[PDB]
Structure formats: structure tokens, C-alpha cells
Design a protein around this ligand. Structure first.
Ligand code: CL
Ligand code: NA
Ligand code: NA
Ligand code: NA
Lengths: 186, 206
């Protein structure tokens, strides 16, 4: 039942996207606000290498099978870094209540969103190739660096990327919902 | 005889996630600029570009049309002021279009009193999204707020309408006249300004 499916998926993605923003802000005001960590962030996401549409036109031109697969690949690629973000922050002695709190929600909801997404692909495109191929994140050494400024800059890159990518998943899902269910007459 | 003060880009905005405009201001405490140049580059490119349109957003502004606008990609931009005496560069400004979206206000706000036999009568508010936003493809998602008040009341009544373009308000003082406005925000970004008021008379028999 596509309509309820897409509605659940979009409820999730919009929630996650909003949480990502609030998290990146709350980290930024508290830790980084005065300093040029914003400049270290220039093209440093583990998912940069993926071909993602960057404007509406590019979005419309994509075919819907590849587009769904894309969303799935991005979500899969985030399960590793969100696990370590949580483990690291939770393992601090004095863990900032706000941030950790959001981080845990994003982690859990993201699992659920990927379940709904995988289920969408099953209804809409049942004869797809069962093949994982998503970018690999391997930034844990940096999140664990003893140099504090280097450490903060790792975390900043990461939250900046999480915010971008969740906003992106959300937008793309909204787009596909209108396309698949409403022939782009939402 | 004085070269220009340091200029500042003090606002960027996107009305619909397809184009955007940025505005700068001259530094007072330098000479008069006779020219400005906005240059920028994007994240993960080394090409330097010039502002593509200095006209559209009027005075001291750079406007990026569809073909120069993309999401999820940082713009690194700088403006300089020059005159015959020399020059001065603004601080670099980092901009991600995704986070500077503020829609124009919603359109065609109409209000009507509906009095039916069988149920409580009501106020019926209707409006339209701003032109220029693509809701129908799903590229843009809009949320609305209504406010209303009779003149001289201290506080506005606020009602979140979600994604609907119409709303029903059940409880109003008979005979009293209300001002109603509506604004909207995207899923990520800033509330628009409130629309102009429409005024409605609540008839005495309500
Ligand atoms: Cl706002
Ligand atoms: Na614009
Ligand atoms: Na101009
Ligand atoms: Na564009």
C-alpha cells in the first residue's frame, strides 16, 4: 500500500532531517561557533563520490529505479558513521545531553527509514538485483584523535555531512512520492 | 583621495530553492566605490566565477539564476570595491543554498463566514502558495500559519495549518471585526513575511 508506505517514509525522513539540523546547530553554537571549522569542510563527505542530483531538473531527469537505489545507498552508507558517532559520544564522561540525545534518535530512526525504503523498492521494483554497493566511511581514527582542534574538526565535518545528506534524502523522497503517486501533481 | 572601505555581504536568500540573491553594503570610512565585483567558487571545483547578473536584485546585489544555482554545494564568495585610488575585499562568505530559503508570503487570502443549520457556524480561510515555488513535483514543501485578531486586542490568535491551503476557525466573537494574515515556511528555512490582512465582519447572529 504505497500511499501509507510513502507517508511513513516521509514522516521519518523529515523528522531525521530536522534532528540533523538541530544537532549540527547545537554542536556549532557550543563548540565551534568562534573559529574557522566551516572552511575545513570543503568536499569532505564520504558520499561526495556518489552521483546525486543537485537541482530539480537533474532530479526530474533521473529514472525512478536508479533514484530509489540512490536513496537506499546513502542510507546504507550512514549506518557505520552514525554507530560510531553515538558510541563515541556516549562513552564520554561528561556527554552533552542535547547532542547525544539527538544522535541516538537519528541512529534509530535511520534504521527504520531504511526498512521502509527497502520495502518500497520491493513493491515498486520487485525485479531488482539484490546488490549492495555504497561508499565506505572510515573516519573513526580522526573522531578519536587526541589533538582537540583536529578532533572537533572531524566532528564538524561529520555533522555537516549528516545534515546535508539527511536533508537530501528527505528532499529526494518527497520528489519520488509526488512522481510515483501523483504524477508530479502534488 | 581615499580608497574604499571593506564591503560586507550581509544577506543571501533563495525564494524557492532554484535561484538565489545576495546583497552587500559598502564600508563607510573609506572613499566612494566606483565599482564592485563579486566573485565566487564552489566546493570541489577550482574554477573562479564572476557574479552572473548584477541587475536583477537591484542595488549592490548578485543574482544567481537557475543555471548557476545548485543545492547541497557550498558557494565561497567575496566582493571587492574599487575606485581610482585602490581597493578593498570583503570577508569570504560561505553559503549553502539549502539554508537560506525564505519563501515569499502566500497569496489570495480569502475569508468567509459559513453559517449552516446542523453544525456550529465557522470561519473559512483560504489561500494559495506563492507563485514561483514548485510544490507539485515535490521539490518544495510548504507549511502555513494563520494569525488573526480584532483591532485593539493585545494578542494574536495563532493556528498552525500544516500543509493545507484552507482552515476552519470555530470560535469568534459575534459582531467583532478580525484581521487575518497568513505566512509560510519551508520544511527547512525561514518563515516568510505575513501576507497583507484581509478583514472580516463576524455577523451579530453567530
Ligand atoms: Cl524564521
Ligand atoms: Na532570487
Ligand atoms: Na548589483
Ligand atoms: Na540549477
Amino acid at each position: 500500500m504505497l500511499r501509507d508506505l510513502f507517508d511513513r517514509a516521509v514522516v521519518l525522513s523529515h523528522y531525521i532531517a530536522n534532528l540533523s539540523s538541530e544537532m549540527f546547530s547545537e554542536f556549532d553554537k557550543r563548540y565551534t561557533h568562534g573559529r574557522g571549522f566551516i572552511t575545513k569542510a570543503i568536499n569532505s563527505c564520504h558520499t561526495s563520490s556518489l552521483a546525486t542530483p543537485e537541482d530539480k531538473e537533474q532530479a526530474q531527469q533521473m529514472n525512478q529505479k536508479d533514484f530509489l537505489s540512490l536513496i537506499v545507498s546513502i542510507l546504507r552508507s550512514w549506518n557505520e558513521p552514525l554507530y560510531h558517532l553515538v558510541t563515541e559520544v556516549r562513552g564520554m564522561q561528561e556527554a552533552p545531553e542535547a547532542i547525544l540525545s539527538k544522535a541516538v534518535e537519528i541512529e534509530e530512526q535511520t534504521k527504520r527509514l531504511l526498512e521502509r525504503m527497502e520495502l518500497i523498492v520491493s513493491q515498486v521494483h520487485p525485479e531488482t538485483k539484490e546488490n549492495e554497493i555504497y561508499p565506505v566511511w572510515s573516519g573513526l581514527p580522526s573522531l578519536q584523535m587526541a589533538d582537540e582542534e583536529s578532533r572537533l574538526s572531524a566532528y564538524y565535518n561529520l555533522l555537516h555531512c549528516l545534515r546535508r545528506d539527511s536533508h537530501k534524502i528527505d528532499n529526494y523522497l518527497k520528489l519520488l512520492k509526488c512522481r510515483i503517486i501523483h504524477n508530479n501533481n502534488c | 583621495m581615499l580608497p574604499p572601505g571593506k564591503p560586507e555581504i550581509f544577506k543571501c536568500r533563495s525564494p524557492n530553492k532554484e535561484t538565489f540573491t545576495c546583497w552587500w553594503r559598502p564600508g563607510t570610512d573609506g572613499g566612494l566605490p566606483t565599482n564592485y565585483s563579486l566573485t565566487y567558487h564552489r566546493e570541489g571545483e577550482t574554477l573562479m566565477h564572476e557574479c552572473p547578473d548584477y541587475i536583477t536584485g537591484g542595488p549592490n546585489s548578485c543574482h544567481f539564476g537557475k543555471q548557476y544555482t545548485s543545492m547541497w554545494r557550498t558557494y565561497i564568495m567575496m566582493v571587492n570595491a574599487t575606485n581610482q585610488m585602490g581597493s578593498s575585499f570583503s570577508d569570504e562568505l560561505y553559503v549553502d543554498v539549502t539554508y537560506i530559503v525564505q519563501p515569499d508570503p502566500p497569496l489570495e487570502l480569502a475569508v468567509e463566514v459559513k453559517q449552516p443549520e446542523d453544525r456550529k457556524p465557522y470561519l473559512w480561510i483560504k489561500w494559495s502558495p506563492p507563485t514561483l515555488i514548485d510544490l507539485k513535483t515535490g521539490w518544495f514543501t510548504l507549511l502555513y500559519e494563520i494569525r488573526l485578531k480584532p483591532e485593539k486586542a493585545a494578542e494574536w490568535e495563532i493556528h498552525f495549518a500544516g500543509q493545507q491551503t484552507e482552515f476552519k476557525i470555530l470560535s469568534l466573537h459575534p459582531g467583532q471585526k478580525y484581521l487575518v494574515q497568513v505566512r509560510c515556511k519551508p520544511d527547512a528555512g525561514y518563515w516568510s513575511a505575513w501576507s497583507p490582512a484581509t478583514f472580516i465582519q463576524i455577523p451579530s447572529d453567530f
